Structure 1
Amino acid sequence: EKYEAVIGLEIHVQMDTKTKMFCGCKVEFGAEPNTNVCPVCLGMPGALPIVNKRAVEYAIRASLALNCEVHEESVFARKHYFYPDLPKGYQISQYEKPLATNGWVELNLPNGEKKKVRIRRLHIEEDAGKNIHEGDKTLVDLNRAGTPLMEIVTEPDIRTPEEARLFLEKLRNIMRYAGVSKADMEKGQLRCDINVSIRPKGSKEFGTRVEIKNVNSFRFVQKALEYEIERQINVVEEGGEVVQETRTFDPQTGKTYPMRTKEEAEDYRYFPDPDLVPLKVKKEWIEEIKKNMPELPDQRFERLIKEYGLSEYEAGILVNHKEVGDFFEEAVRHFKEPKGIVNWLINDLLGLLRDKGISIEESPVKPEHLAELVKLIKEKVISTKIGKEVIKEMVETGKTPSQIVEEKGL
């Protein structure tokens, strides 16, 4: 191929707080419209914002986990636009003087190599609400307005659709491991807008940038990108110029479309919110969050390989799905036979639960039961053949391995 894809992403991550960013209303999914609502978060006259401490704490932890420099002074600014789901006429975020800067995420590529994608910024901001369309009207639920978001911006360091997806998956897993957000696109805890240009291979200048908004799964961003790169290469080689705009992606067609509305953005008239003093982050607080950081995916990966002698194939599975690793370790704790437990977990239990449609957090076979079953296999109390018969019923019923051994004779 003659060209090169230059890809950047802008991600909004919903922070798993109890409370909104600027008032004490609950953050929760699928409540009755306009019930978790305030004078503050409703943009009512006379109502004033108050910063959420935990939101701040979580956003610092996120920043560090993303290897960013966390700035001891940042400032909330008012970002102005008129839209029905935006109560104040402005969104309170950060602009010049964001919380964190100059970071990186490391990707593990499927051909063996490790790449870095830079994090340009991480800032704190609040969410708008949601519109529903019904007939000639729009109905507005402001339950989500003022929910804490981390806006994360990538340098245009991504080169490949797969890499975009792999980036998103790694971010999600960091967020989850750090414990700052659930980060599932399904519940809209994670949004992603895509920026993409193409470039003759090895060139150092940037090509014209296209923006793709509202893609809704990690799979869909790979698809949108896959198509869009082709779309742009077609244009340039036909002798045309690629035009700077925003586009949309239809999942059903797997294609990206221009917009009928030629609506230019408008100056956001940014400036510090006079209702808020600057955010001052003591160094001692950063130090404390640093010291007490939960374990992160890349760290866990090397630890399992060492502490349990797992293969890179094995550890990768247990780490990419945190709760599987969590299960494994609680099991190995009951019976210290790691090699055996990963076998029966990966090769047997996981696929059995998949088939019933049950998540590992909620499996009838508790870590104790798998450790017990593997114990009977090692101690030659039952055969592998009989072991594969009792595991099937363990999932089916919920009874202990030694329960069903006796019930059906040893």
Structure 2
Amino acid sequence: EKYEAVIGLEIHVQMDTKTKMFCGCKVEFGAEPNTNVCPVCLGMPGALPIVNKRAVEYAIRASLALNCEVHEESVFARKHYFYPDLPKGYQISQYEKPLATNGWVELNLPNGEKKKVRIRRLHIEEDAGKNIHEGDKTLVDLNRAGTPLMEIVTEPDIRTPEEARLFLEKLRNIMRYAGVSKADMEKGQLRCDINVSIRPKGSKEFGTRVEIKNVNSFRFVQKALEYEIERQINVVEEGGEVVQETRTFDPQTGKTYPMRTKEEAEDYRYFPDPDLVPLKVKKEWIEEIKKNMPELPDQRFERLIKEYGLSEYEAGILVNHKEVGDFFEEAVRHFKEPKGIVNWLINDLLGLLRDKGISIEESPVKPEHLAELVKLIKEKVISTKIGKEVIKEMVETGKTPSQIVEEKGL
């Protein structure tokens, strides 16, 4: 190809705290609209914000997990705009002086092998509410208003629709691994906004940028980008100039579309929120979070290859879906036959659970039961053929392998 795709992404990750960012209302999915609510998050007259400590602690854990420099001083700014799901007229985030800066995420590619996407910033902000349209009216649930979010911004380092997806997947996995957000786009805990230009290959200056807002799955971002890149390429070789705008993506058509409303944005009138003193983060606290950091995926991936002699294909499976690795490790602990357990987990148990629709967190076969089953295969008590028969029923029922060996004879 003559061109090159330059992709940058803007992710808003919802932090898994119990409490909102600036008040003690609960964060929880579901239900009753305007239920977990406040003078404060309702942006009522006279209501003041108060910083959630965990949100901060999770926002630091996440920055570090992303190799960001965490700044000891950062400042909440007011970000002004009028919209029904924004109770105050402003959103409290961070502007100049964000929490974290100069980080990076590492990608593992089908094969260029190994690549880096830089994190431009990670800032702390609060969420808006949701709107529902119904007739000539919009209905506003401010339950989600004020929810803690990390806004994460990438450098234009991504080059490929797939890399865009691989990025989001890895980001998700770190978040989950650090345990700061559930980060499933399905549940509304990860939003992503896409920025795309093209150059001609090897040129060092940037092309006109299009923004694609509100794509809702990792698959959809890849698709949106896939189309959009072809779209711009068409425009440029036809002799036209690619116009800088926002666009939208229809899942059903797989296409990206300009907007009827010709609405330019407005000055956010940023300035520090005088209801809040600057966030001073002690170095001792960072060190403490750094020292007690959970195990991250890139580290887990190397540890398993060593501690259990798994293959890069085996460990990948187990690390990308954390709960499987968690399962695997509890099982190997019951019976230290690692090669055997991974075989029966990947080749057998996983496929069987997928077929019912049951996730590994909730499987009837507990790590104990698989380690037990594998044990009878090693100690030659049953055959591989019968082992494959008792596993189908282990899942079918919930019984131990040695329950059904007896019950059916051997």
TM range (shorter): over 0.9
Measured against aligned partners, the alpha-carbon deviations of 1:360-388 in whole angstroms (never above 9, x if no partner) come to: 00000000000000000000000000000
Aligned counterpart, 1:302: 302
SS of the counterpart of 2:199? strand
| Rounded Cα–Cα distance in structure 1 between residues aligned with 2:112 and 2:327 | 27
SS of the counterpart of 1:368? helix
Shift, 1:205, TM fit:
0.3
SS of the counterpart of 2:13? strand
Measured against aligned partners, the alpha-carbon deviations of 1:66-87 in whole angstroms (never above 9, x if no partner) come to: 0000000000000000000000
SS of the counterpart of 1:404? helix
Aligned counterpart, 2:47: 47
Shift, 1:111, TM fit:
1.2
Aligned length in residues: 410
Q: Does 1:344 align with 2:325?
A: no
Aligned counterpart, 2:63: 63
| Rounded Cα–Cα distance in structure 1 between residues aligned with 2:111 and 2:99 | 35
Measured against aligned partners, the alpha-carbon deviations of 1:266-293 in whole angstroms (never above 9, x if no partner) come to: 0000000000000000000000000000
| Rounded Cα–Cα distance in structure 2 between residues aligned with 1:213 and 1:57 | 29
| Rounded Cα–Cα distance in structure 1 between residues aligned with 2:44 and 2:72 | 32
| Rounded Cα–Cα distance in structure 2 between residues aligned with 1:53 and 1:408 | 57
| Rounded Cα–Cα distance in structure 2 between residues aligned with 1:393 and 1:272 | 62
| Rounded Cα–Cα distance in structure 1 between residues aligned with 2:252 and 2:335 | 49
Measured against aligned partners, the alpha-carbon deviations of 1:13-40 in whole angstroms (never above 9, x if no partner) come to: 0000000000000000012000000000
Shift, 1:89, TM fit:
0.1
SS of the counterpart of 1:187? coil
Q: Tell me: CA distance 1:104–1:75, structure 2 relative to 1, closer, same or farther (3 Å).
A: same
Aligned counterpart, 1:234: 234
| Rounded Cα–Cα distance in structure 1 between residues aligned with 2:104 and 2:258 | 32
Aligned counterpart, 1:369: 369
| Rounded Cα–Cα distance in structure 2 between residues aligned with 1:388 and 1:112 | 38
| Rounded Cα–Cα distance in structure 2 between residues aligned with 1:286 and 1:269 | 31
Aligned counterpart, 1:264: 264
Measured against aligned partners, the alpha-carbon deviations of 1:318-368 in whole angstroms (never above 9, x if no partner) come to: 000000000000000000000000000000000000000000000000000
| Rounded Cα–Cα distance in structure 2 between residues aligned with 1:323 and 1:278 | 38
| Rounded Cα–Cα distance in structure 1 between residues aligned with 2:164 and 2:38 | 38
SS of the counterpart of 1:284? helix
Question: CA-atom RMSD, angstroms?
Answer: 0.3
Measured against aligned partners, the alpha-carbon deviations of 1:195-231 in whole angstroms (never above 9, x if no partner) come to: 0000000000000000000000000000000000000
| Rounded Cα–Cα distance in structure 2 between residues aligned with 1:245 and 1:192 | 17
Shift, 1:146, TM fit:
0.1
Shift, 1:112, TM fit:
5.1
SS of the counterpart of 1:398? coil
| Rounded Cα–Cα distance in structure 2 between residues aligned with 1:161 and 1:218 | 10
Q: Which 5+ residue runs of structure 1 have no aligned equivalent?
A: none
Shift, 1:93, TM fit:
0.1
| Rounded Cα–Cα distance in structure 2 between residues aligned with 1:334 and 1:55 | 37
Measured against aligned partners, the alpha-carbon deviations of 1:90-138 in whole angstroms (never above 9, x if no partner) come to: 0000000000000000000001510000000000000000000000000
TM-score, normalisation: structure 2: 1.00
| Rounded Cα–Cα distance in structure 1 between residues aligned with 2:44 and 2:99 | 28
Which runs of structure 1 show a deviation greater than 6 angstroms over 4 or more consecutive aligned residues? none
SS of the counterpart of 2:27? coil
SS of the counterpart of 1:336? coil
| Rounded Cα–Cα distance in structure 1 between residues aligned with 2:215 and 2:323 | 26
Identity percentage of aligned residues: 100
Aligned counterpart, 2:325: 325
| Rounded Cα–Cα distance in structure 2 between residues aligned with 1:30 and 1:264 | 34
| Rounded Cα–Cα distance in structure 2 between residues aligned with 1:126 and 1:328 | 37
SS of the counterpart of 1:149? strand
Measured against aligned partners, the alpha-carbon deviations of 1:240-265 in whole angstroms (never above 9, x if no partner) come to: 00000000000000000000000000
Aligned counterpart, 2:277: 277
Aligned counterpart, 1:208: 208
| Rounded Cα–Cα distance in structure 2 between residues aligned with 1:229 and 1:345 | 40
SS of the counterpart of 1:84? coil
Measured against aligned partners, the alpha-carbon deviations of 1:27-65 in whole angstroms (never above 9, x if no partner) come to: 000120000000000000000000000000000000000
| Rounded Cα–Cα distance in structure 1 between residues aligned with 2:113 and 2:375 | 38
SS of the counterpart of 1:192? strand
SS of the counterpart of 1:162? helix
| Rounded Cα–Cα distance in structure 1 between residues aligned with 2:408 and 2:216 | 49
| Rounded Cα–Cα distance in structure 2 between residues aligned with 1:199 and 1:334 | 56
| Rounded Cα–Cα distance in structure 1 between residues aligned with 2:155 and 2:320 | 24
Shift, 1:235, TM fit:
0.2
Q: Which 5+ residue runs of structure 2 have no aligned equivalent?
A: none
